[PDB]
Design a protein around this ligand. Structure first.
Ligand SMILES: Nc1nc2c(ncn2[C@@H]2O[C@@H]3COP(=O)(O)O[C@H]4[C@@H](O)[C@H](n5cnc6c(=O)[nH]c(N)nc65)O[C@@H]4COP(=O)(O)O[C@H]3[C@H]2O)c(=O)[nH]1
Ligand SMILES: Nc1nc2c(ncn2[C@@H]2O[C@@H]3COP(=O)(O)O[C@H]4[C@@H](O)[C@H](n5cnc6c(=O)[nH]c(N)nc65)O[C@@H]4COP(=O)(O)O[C@H]3[C@H]2O)c(=O)[nH]1
Ligand SMILES: Nc1nc2c(ncn2[C@@H]2O[C@@H]3COP(=O)(O)O[C@H]4[C@@H](O)[C@H](n5cnc6c(=O)[nH]c(N)nc65)O[C@@H]4COP(=O)(O)O[C@H]3[C@H]2O)c(=O)[nH]1
Ligand SMILES: Nc1nc2c(ncn2[C@@H]2O[C@@H]3COP(=O)(O)O[C@H]4[C@@H](O)[C@H](n5cnc6c(=O)[nH]c(N)nc65)O[C@@H]4COP(=O)(O)O[C@H]3[C@H]2O)c(=O)[nH]1
Ligand SMILES: Nc1nc2c(ncn2[C@@H]2O[C@H](COP(=O)(O)OP(=O)(O)OP(=O)(O)O)[C@@H](OP(=O)(O)OP(=O)(O)O)[C@H]2O)c(=O)[nH]1
Ligand SMILES: Nc1nc2c(ncn2[C@@H]2O[C@H](COP(=O)(O)OP(=O)(O)OP(=O)(O)O)[C@@H](OP(=O)(O)OP(=O)(O)O)[C@H]2O)c(=O)[nH]1
Ligand SMILES: [Mg+2]
Ligand SMILES: [Mg+2]
Lengths: 445, 448
């Protein structure tokens, strides 16, 4: 379901690429003019753009520059399709802002490698864009330069050339011993460049070893492959390399691929080791151990949409403990936390694991029950009520025992067009009414 | 580098399997009798055990039962290799504790599919085990493979009904015939999607690729029912990102085994990433500064120092302690002190390379692990950092206040083949101590 925009003047080329890409389960849009491409790019906001440099009127380089000037299309990765000995073409493309390059005649292996790699990058890009938008409301090197690149190659000449090409923009280190390289790769390395055609070690075995250990399982790896051996090239892509580099190594291709991998790694690490560990983006309540409102919100959105399309409904239970303030006033805040934890355990144990028992508020809990009807939901609520009210809660490490009552509000996504908010709203009305009409009760709306 | 133990009485079979697995970059150990297998399993603690059910003396079922009785080998997934006529074999294997099955003659596609699935499961298993040990020395939700919401995407009603019935006793199955509705459902609280690759009104691989294309469903466990004759479809399904394949006609025991493995792996992963990884003790980044913490540094420094001991360029370490931070707190409050720390972190990261590791060692102490650098250059870098901190003031209180900070730095570098991360950090600590004694705003170097 990745959307790719193919841009070329010759109809046959565009259609051929479209056929190949759609056969690989890609949604393909086509443009036959530079201006048309730019308009379509701003309209459809694609995920990847494949653009040919050889275009009468507006050359591909100009289109790329315009794409990189529009702030609405700047994020979209652009691959420039060049011809043989297109070193000048590649230099101008890098100056134009192309993310990577493809050489003509198009190799299906290289084509799909680039598309796969850059679609993954686009995933991370889109996620960061979303999170930045959220974080602006209040609820860090992200370039592709200055990275530690480990070159695992026995060819001293090739290694030196690669290090030199990467020596102005990145920080290269060369290793010839596979074991020493394994030790180093477990450290502060941003990208590993391995020679698949090494003669003193099996680079593919080394790469598989990296992917086998969790420490290095997601370390970005690029493999220098000989264009003759299609088999090893495919195998390298299978053992888990992120992209491939043809031998002899073109400096501009190297620069593009290295920058792509480093930027992807940095984005991903920022999103998962910094942002995801923030207190606002959490999905699990640390006290109870249950999920929070965020998790239920997303899941309930999908559930409710499915229900609108027709089928079995999604039910919701809102449970509010009764007189919790008194628990805290008499036994202290810590005992109240104990009560909350135990309540969470009892609740989760008496509802299905396919259900979503989450902590809606401080003393309020929600149980989203997929494929459940209002009548059955009311009966489940009565079950929960009996289990919580019946058995006492033992606290103070056995020193004291307390009895808890709960008021429950039941709701169901019955009929079409219902929304998560309406379902929760009806459940809240149920809770209010149950609290007014005495306590220890279940009310359905 | 995942370690597999192959167990069979016939040497030829053992050698054949060993050859294939080692050709796929797997470390293979071999056993030809049950007792030897059990001893090797308890000693080497393998990652996966491929065990033949038909073995003279101790049958494969007995070996499986014994492995699941030993608390040191219970965690290891066991694959039982059966024959064509294996319904009884599979039922007994499930009762013995087998994780999954492989049928003889061995189909390489299926062999490597099972090995991949179970090695991934073993990774999460080992992580969970480590975390549990940690919590034991530092001191819920369902971690079984049952009771899961399984989405069956198939137009073949007879097949769908049978799979739903078979999975209706241990799990909660839902049947979807429309791929679009199924896509919406898969975006929800689903534990596993079972899709028919040989569907007649939709391309099951297209549906699978769509799921893997969106981040919401990118890692959702998917099993694909495949026809054994069309090898091409099976290979393609495994390439688009299916977790394992199920041959048609669907064998109930194979269905049960694969479903449990996928659901349990999902549960383990979710527990480790949405609960444990978000715990405060397993964090890797300091929330205030935004820099990495001591834990991250420790791991990276281990790898670095090991490389250095093996011979090569050295690793340098900078320990930076702010001078008179207590006065900052006493005068402007802890919140202003936190602002000072945040800005200090930014400046530090900005004046050292990104290949370096600027982390928060302590409360007011920072560490800069600089890979592939010598002590002299490290001392000059420390001087650069010192000048940048002392030169420019730190603006706090939303601009209302400006404060000057000084720092004492201790620099050390890895020397010889016997050095350890701890020794390097200790030498840097001694440098910091001396710099605090010898006035302040100073850098001191210690070399073994
Ligand atoms: N999402 C969700 N829905 C729930 C829950 N509890 C009851 N229901 C819904 O209510 C229906 C009727 O359940 P029942 O009257 O208790 O009569 C039930 C019950 O006696 C039994 N059953 C099914 N699962 C369980 C279980 O896990 N434990 C026990 N003790 N009985 C179960 O099978 C009968 C039919 O159940 P179903 O056909 O599935 O149809 C169920 C189910 O859709 C729940 O905790 N979560
Ligand atoms: N009265 C009633 N209670 C329900 C129902 N559904 C869920 N529960 C309650 O929720 C507990 C956990 O069910 P589970 O997590 O799905 O985990 C359950 C489930 O996985 C399994 N189980 C029992 N009967 C069935 C069944 O008929 N179908 C399926 N798919 N699983 C069942 O046993 C596990 C433990 O179940 P329990 O010991 O009974 O303890 C159950 C039960 O108290 C229901 O429909 N009616
Ligand atoms: N791990 C680590 N080591 C550091 C750092 N700063 C300096 N060094 C080490 O000290 C060597 C000499 O650096 P320099 O005397 O300042 O003289 C440097 C400097 O003038 C220049 N240079 C390299 N990178 C940069 C940079 O990122 N910014 C600036 N302004 N100059 C740079 O190139 C000269 C040679 O640098 P190298 O050949 O690579 O060799 C460097 C490097 O190994 C650091 O922040 N982290
Ligand atoms: N591969 C390579 N990249 C270069 C070179 N020169 C500049 N850069 C890149 O451009 C970034 C900006 O350097 P800066 O503004 O001077 O700001 C630098 C600089 O102030 C200081 N620094 C880093 N290395 C050195 C060095 O070798 N000598 C001195 N005196 N300062 C350095 O640390 C800052 C951050 O450096 P980085 O994080 O690595 O981020 C640097 C680095 O990635 C080079 O010669 N080779
Ligand atoms: N122990 C504990 N209690 C929590 C927590 N989160 C929310 N609460 C408690 O829940 C109360 C709010 O829920 P309410 O509906 O107002 O309580 P109820 O009295 O049960 O109302 P009701 O009439 O039944 O509808 C808080 O009031 P106060 O903060 O004023 O009470 P304190 O600070 O002393 O802990 C807290 O006591 C928590 O994490 N731990
Ligand atoms: N505002 C703030 N301060 C922090 C933080 N983390 C650590 N600290 C404070 O930093 C101080 C540690 O500094 P020290 O090693 O004791 O040395 P200093 O006296 O600062 O300078 P020196 O090098 O010895 O001349 C502690 O002061 P005390 O232990 O006396 O406690 P409090 O901070 O409440 O006073 C810590 O509380 C933080 O996150 N925010
Ligand atoms: Mg209340
Ligand atoms: Mg101090």
């Amino acid at each position: 379901s990745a959307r790719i925009l193919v841009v070329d003047d010759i109809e046959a080329n565009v259609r051929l690429l479209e056929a190949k890409l759609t056969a690989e389960y890609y949604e393909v849009s086509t443009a036959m003019d530079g201006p048309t491409a730019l308009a379509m790019a701003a309209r459809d906001l694609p995920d990847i753009i494949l653009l040919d440099v050889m275009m009468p009127g507006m050359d591909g380089f100009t289109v790329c520059r315009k794409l990189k000037d529009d702030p609405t299309t700047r994020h979209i990765p652009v691959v420039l399709i060049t011809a043989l000995d297109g070193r000048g073409d590649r230099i101008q493309g890098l100056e134009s802002g192309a993310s990577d390059f493809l050489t003509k005649p198009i190799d299906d292996v290289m084509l799909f490698a680039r598309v796969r790699s850059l679609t993954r990058f686009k995933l991370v890009i889109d996620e960061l864009r979303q999170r930045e938008a959220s974080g602006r409301r209040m609820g860090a090197r992200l370039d592709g330069l200055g990275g530690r690149v480990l070159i695992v190659d026995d060819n001293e000449r090739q290694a030196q050339r690669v290090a030199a090409e990467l020596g102005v923009e990145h920080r290269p280190v060369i290793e010839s011993d596979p074991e020493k390289a394994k030790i180093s790769a477990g450290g502060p390395v941003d990208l590993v460049i391995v020679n698949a055609a090494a003669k003193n070690f099996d680079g593919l075995r080394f790469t598989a070893a990296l992917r086998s250990e969790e420490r290095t399982r997601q370390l970005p790896v690029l493999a220098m492959v000989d264009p003759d051996d299609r088999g090893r090239m495919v195998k390298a892509l299978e053992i888990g390399v992120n992209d491939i580099l043809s031998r002899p190594i073109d400096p501009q291709e190297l620069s593009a691929r290295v920058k792509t991998q480093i930027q992807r790694k940095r984005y991903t690490d920022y999103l998962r080791n910094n942002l995801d560990h923030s207190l606002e983006l959490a999905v699990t309540d640390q006290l109870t151990g249950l999920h929070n409102r965020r998790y239920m919100t997303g899941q309930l959105d999908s559930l409710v949409k499915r229900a609108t399309l027709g089928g079995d409904p999604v039910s919701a239970l809102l449970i509010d403990i009764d007189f919790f303030k008194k628990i805290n006033d008499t036994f202290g805040h810590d005992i109240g936390d104990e009560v909350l934890r135990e309540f969470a355990l009892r609740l989760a144990s008496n509802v299905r694991a396919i259900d979503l028992p989450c902590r809606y508020g401080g003393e309020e809990f929600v149980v989203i029950m997929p494929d459940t009807a209002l009548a059955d939901a009311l009966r489940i609520a009565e079950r929960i009520r009996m289990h919580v009210s019946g058995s006492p809660f033992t606290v103070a490490h056995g020193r004291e025992m307390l009895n808890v009552t709960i008021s429950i509000g039941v709701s169901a996504t019955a009929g079409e067009g219902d929304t998560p908010e309406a379902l929760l709203k009806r459940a809240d009305e149920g809770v209010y009414q149950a609290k007014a009409s005495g306590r220890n009760a279940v009310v359905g709306k």
